[PDB]
Structures are given as structure tokens and as C-alpha cells.
């Protein structure tokens, strides 16, 4: 029974530090909010972040070379045996400039990237200690990570690294990332998407003089005009846009170059490659169309096939233990546990076929990727929050 | 017979002032040339080039009030009677803070804008002068003219004013046009253009979240594919081009507003307009076709429809005495004529059925339009040509 370790004395002890020291837990929260880890920045957040790490005793505290910081909290079984991995990201969706600066009222917290994400790396370290300052024994090794790119093109960078490189590759067994507050969140599905721009170009040429050549921009609006006939299914959900355009110089001139971006997203890795597939088709096609209809005499048209944004799609089946073990204790907990898709740090686990859940940290939080994101931090909710991730973890790495 | 104006002693006796004051008139192109011109900022010139034409000793000197520049050479027929209209423009294609500095190099000078149109501007006050002191009398009053608004989104603005509402549109029964260097030049036909920006929008959204409702990215796609089946003849020549497009912020959304620019021209008025009949209709047919395709649960498509470029097409009959003057006379100077269609200020007068044709300054020239553009003032090739359009101008108002 995975809810079991909930009733263990080692977890209640842990659980009694964690109320202990829940005004260290919120110290680090404001402290690491107001260090700004906008994308492809994240160096100072993790630099503090390993230094955290090390003072909450973990092992082997690095970061690696794509920018991750981690440790790791030594098990009771064989070394380099099959591990679990929790990581909660360092990046923000805020840009560089972005100005910080923590807003305290009552028990709420104001300040950009407080919930999503930094709550999590402060909940992930106060596990980290009340773990080995209760004495707690586990079976699987865990890894707690600090990770880089889980927002915008940061395009799941850190844990692609983490998962395909780095020196754990081969041992996790077990992921999960701790993404937003809510702690009832059980995200088993991963929501894949594929973005591209297209420049189509072509000699260009006067537009009355040189009337009759080809034309990128009607190869161009002939693809979106195709895309929008892509057949998408409602269930797995499916969707594509046709999204950003640009390029021309004046209607004295047939344009030379051109562009159109386009989005292509679904729940399922086998309808995402459909749609992705049929696209491309559709781009050389439409090229293929215009140099048949109008004169390539001056030079035919061309697509440039750019790659803009790139996740993969996936999903932890429900029968799996991970998800056993988070469902169950959630369920302990009184919470609701509702599994969904989302687009999380998970997905790149789940695209490896290795087991893979995303979980919330706890406590109320609202406006996240807004600048008036909040987090409330009244210990009674922030707390009891806190401890769902936690009997989830120990539950899949087991203890003694 | 046209012509025989050259061996009138009026003439010979003007053309003898033309020589000896040629160096005049070169000190007269370099100094309006260096007066920048840019659409719609011709008033400084224009306020120089009235200067000049009182000093040329011409009647009612006076700037109307679209811009235009004009002073009267009066014939001897009654007040208020016929009158030939010329017209050189005073704007340039050259956008403001253009650096104009004339550069003399031999016989050449280089400037922007100095043969299309400031040649010009200098030659027709030459002709004022030499004709005022040679005693040439004329039967119908000359009106001459700096005009404005023939480059670019200009649209013709000034002719339009001279021949549609200022103080000389009902007495204008001959009009010219001399534009540009080449004195062999006959434009009899005026190629007529019309232009618009369609802005397409919609309600936006999240492009997975809302997937599903329309797109103006769509309707504006089909617009240019449909369009580009319009049927354009060859003769009379007829096209059309998808010019410049924008809109869109970002692959995560669903745009809420794009556009494209469209091109349309033909000698024909009337294949113009079944090509622009037929854009329309495309528009809206575009519009409805997303509206039925996509969700309006959000809001409809809508499509803004704009004219940014209007210029009539029309031409002057081949028979019309104005374009046989020009034809014999430009035989007699030893020069081939060989009547065109081009877009000029011409268009407008043919467009209001005034006998109408574009005609050039004289001499070498080059790079028209150009940052690099030059003329030669060598006199005797810039002198002869020059001598051209002054036979012209007084075989079509008459003299005595
Ligand atoms: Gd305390
Ligand atoms: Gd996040
Ligand atoms: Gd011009």
C-alpha cells in the first residue's frame, strides 16, 4: 500500500521539522524569488541553488554542464542503482529586467515566478533536510534537481540533458517535476507541440512589369490555406495555427521573401507526428504549386523549413506505480487527485518512456506567469500542502 | 502643318535666348534641385519655384491651395477663353533627410531627383522667359505649372486640384506634362492603378485553449489564392500583385488581426475595374467561407477594406491634334517618336477627357528614381532637346 508511508514514524518525524522550520522554508523562497532567472539566465539562480543543496546535506551537490544543479540523498541499496528524480525548475517565463522584489500582505507574497516555480526548489530542500535530520532510510537513491529550460523556448533543455547525458542517464527511473502550488495535481500526460517558421522567396520583380512570374507569398497563403484542412481529432486533443506573417516591400514590387510561423500541438505523439508530417507535405506542395502556375523564368520559388519550438508529446499510463503512488496519497491527504495533460518538465521523461509524473508544492496560489503572480504562505494550508510531494516521493523511492 | 512652327522667327528668335541663358537655367536646375521635394513637402520648392516664375515675367503668379505652383503667359484671344496647360512637378520620389548636394562631374551633374522632375521644372521657366523676350504672342493663354503630388502616394493630388477644382479646370483644353529627360518621349497613354490594404480581424485567442475558432490568417490566405486566379488580359495589359503582408504575435496564439496589400493596374479603365470588382467579391467571399468553416462563438471575421493608391487609366486618341504637334515636331528635330503608355500626370487630364501627353525636358540622363541619379548638361545635346518641347508647346497653343 503506497499511502502506507504516511504513517511511518520517519515521515511524521520529517513532517514535524517541516512545521519546525517552515519560516526557513519561506526565507528561501524569498530569497531565491529575488534572485531573477529569466530563460537561458538561470546561471545565478542555480549557482545559489547548489550552494542550498550542499547546506541541506545532500551528496555529490554539481551543476551540470547544461546548467542544472543537483544532489543527491543516498539510498540503502546498491550504488548506480535505479533511482528517483524530483526536480523543480529554476527558470522563470520573466525576462531579463523584469524588476523583483517581494511584496509581503498578511500571509500572501507578491512577486513575478514566487509560485511557478520558486516555491518548489525552497519545498524540494526542506524535504531534503527534514529527510536526514529525521534519520529517514530509502531504498532508491533520490536526485533533487534544480533544472533549467522548463518555460518558453528554454524547450525542456535542462532535463533533456539531465535524461539523455548527464551522469544519471541511465538511473532514473522514477521522475518527477514539482511545478506550481496545487498540490492535488496529478499531471500524467504530456501535451507535445511542434513550431516552425517558413520563408518562402522567389527573384521578385516589378509588379506590373514583371506581372506573370511566381509569387512567394501565394505559395505561402496557399499552405495555411491547406493546413486549415488538416483533419484534427477531438480526442486525443489535436490543434495547429497558422500564427505570425510577415514580409513584402511595397505593391510596386512582387515580393522576394516572405514568411508564415505555425504551431502544431496535440496529446498524442502518434496525431502530432500526423500533423507535423502532413505540414511539411503541404510546404513543399504549395512550392511545387506556384512554380507549375505561374514563371520560374526568372528563378523559381524556394521554402526555408526553420524548426522554432520543439516538445515532444506523451504520457505516464494510469496503471503505473508512479501514478498509483501519488493517486493514493493524495487520496490520504483528502485531496482530489484528477489526472490531466499539461506541458511540463515531464514530458521529455514521458517521450523516454520512463515513468513520469508532475506534482504541485502546496498551499494557494494564483497569477502565475502574470507580474502580479502571488503565493499565500499561511502555514496551516502552505504546510499540510507541502507534506502531499513529499509522502509521494517516499513512497516511490520506498523506505526502510 | 505642325512643324512649320520651327521656322517661325518667333521660335528661332527664342530659341537664341535659350542659348545664351542656358548657363542660367543649368544654375537654376542645381538650385531647386538642392531644395528637397519629398511627397507631400513640396512647399518649400514650391514657394521658390513661384518666386521664379514671377521673375520670368508671368501673370498671376500664385500657389493654390492644394500646392500648385502657376503663372500665366497670356495669349491674345479673349480672357477667360482655351487654354494649354504644362506642367512639370515639383516633388520628387526622394523621402525627407535624403542628403541633395550636386555633385559636377565634367558635363554631369548628380543629384536625386535632378532629370524626374527638376530638369524640368528650370526648362519651362526658360521657355517663359525666352518666349517674353522674343515677343512671342500666342493665340490661347499658356498656363504654366509646378505641380504637386505626381511621385508615389502623391496620387496625382495636384493635378487633381488644378483640373477638378482650382480657378483654370474649365479652361484647360490641351494639357502636357513634361516629366523626365528623354525629349523623344510621347506617353499617349496613362496605365491606371488601384491599390488597397485589407486588415483582417478576429476575437484571437489561445492557440490550443481555443483551437478551433476563426482565423483572419485564413480568410486573408484564401483572398491571395483566389485572387491569383483573377483572368488578366494580355491586351489591353492588365495586373495585379499580394504585395506586402503583417500581423500575428506569437505561435502560443491565435492572431487577432493581419493584412495584406494588394496591386492592381491596367491601360484599360475598363479591365481595371473588372479586376477590382473581382477582388472584392473575393474579399467577402473570403470573409464568409472562415465565418462558415471556423467558430464565431467568440466574434465573426471581419475585413476593413482601405484604397491607399488611385490613379486613373485612360489615353490620349492618336488623332487628337495635341499628339499629332508632338509627333511631327519630334520627327522634325530628327527624333523617333514612338507613342507609350506609362503612369504620369497625364493620366488625370485623359481621365477627364483634356487631350493630354507627357513629353521630356531634352538631353542625357540617367538612374531616374536613383540615389545616384545624373543628367549632362552639356550644352549642345541639353539645349536641342530642350528646344523640343518649346515647339510643342507653341504649335498646340498657336501663334501669330
Ligand atoms: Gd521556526
Ligand atoms: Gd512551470
Ligand atoms: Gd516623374
Redesign the interface.
Known amino acids: 500500500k503506497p499511502e502506507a508511508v504516511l504513517k511511518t514514524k520517519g515521515y511524521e518525524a520529517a513532517v514535524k521539522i517541516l512545521d519546525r522550520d517552515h519560516d526557513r522554508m519561506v526565507d528561501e523562497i524569498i530569497k531565491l524569488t529575488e534572485i531573477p532567472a529569466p530563460p537561458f539566465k538561470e546561471a545565478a539562480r542555480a549557482a545559489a541553488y547548489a550552494e542550498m543543496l550542499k547546506d541541506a546535506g545532500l551528496q555529490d551537490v554539481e551543476i551540470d554542464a547544461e546548467g542544472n544543479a543537483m544532489g543527491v540523498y543516498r539510498g540503502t541499496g546498491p550504488a548506480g542503482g535505479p533511482a528517483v528524480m524530483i526536480a523543480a525548475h529554476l527558470d522563470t517565463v520573466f525576462p531579463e529586467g523584469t524588476p523583483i522584489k517581494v511584496r509581503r500582505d498578511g500571509t500572501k507574497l507578491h512577486a513575478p515566478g514566487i509560485g511557478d516555480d520558486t516555491r518548489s526548489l525552497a519545498v524540494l530542500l526542506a524535504y531534503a533536510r527534514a529527510m536526514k535530520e529525521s534519520g529517514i532510510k530509502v531504498k532508491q537513491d533520490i536526485i533533487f534537481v534544480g533544472n533549467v529550460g522548463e518555460e518558453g523556448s528554454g524547450d525542456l533543455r535542462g532535463v533533456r540533458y539531465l535524461l539523455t547525458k548527464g551522469k544519471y542517464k541511465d538511473r532514473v527511473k522514477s521522475f518527477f517535476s514539482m511545478d506550481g502550488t496545487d498540490a492535488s495535481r496529478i499531471v500524467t500526460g504530456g501535451?507535445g507541440?511542434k513550431?516552425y517558421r517558413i520563408t518562402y522567396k522567389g527573384p521578385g520583380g516589378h509588379?506590373?512589369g514583371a506581372?506573370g512570374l511566381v509569387?512567394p507569398?501565394?505559395a505561402?497563403?496557399?499552405?495555411?490555406?491547406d493546413f486549415?484542412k488538416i483533419p484534427?481529432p477531438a480526442k486525443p486533443?489535436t490543434?495547429?495555427?497558422?500564427?505570425?506573417?510577415?514580409?513584402?516591400?511595397?505593391?510596386?514590387?512582387?515580393?522576394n521573401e516572405?514568411y508564415?510561423?505555425?504551431?502544431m500541438?496535440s496529446e498524442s505523439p502518434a496525431e502530432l507526428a500526423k500533423v507535423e508530417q502532413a505540414f511539411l507535405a503541404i510546404v513543399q506542395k504549395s512550392v511545387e504549386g506556384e512554380n507549375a502556375?505561374?514563371s520560374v523564368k526568372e528563378g523559381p520559388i524556394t521554402a526555408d523549413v526553420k524548426m522554432?519550438?520543439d516538445r515532444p508529446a506523451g504520457e505516464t499510463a494510469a496503471t503505473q506505480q508512479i501514478v498509483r503512488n501519488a493517486d493514493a496519497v493524495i487520496r490520504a491527504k483528502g485531496l482530489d487527485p484528477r489526472p490531466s495533460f499539461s506541458s511540463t518538465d515531464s514530458n521529455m521523461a514521458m517521450s523516454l518512456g520512463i515513468p513520469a509524473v508532475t506534482i504541485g508544492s502546496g498551499g494557494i496560489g494564483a497569477r502565475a506567469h502574470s507580474l502580479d503572480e502571488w503565493i499565500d504562505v499561511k502555514k496551516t494550508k502552505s504546510l499540510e500542502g507541502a507534506t502531499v510531494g513529499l509522502g509521494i516521493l517516499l513512497a516511490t523511492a520506498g523506505t526502510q
Chains 1, 2 share one sequence.
Do not use: C, H, L, W
Open positions: 501535451v507541440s513550431r509588379s506590373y506581372f509569387n507569398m501565394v505561402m497563403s496557399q499552405t495555411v490555406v486549415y484534427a486533443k490543434t495547429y495555427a497558422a500564427s505570425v506573417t510577415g514580409g513584402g516591400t511595397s505593391v510596386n514590387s512582387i515580393p516572405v508564415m510561423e505555425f504551431d500541438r502556375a505561374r522554432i519550438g
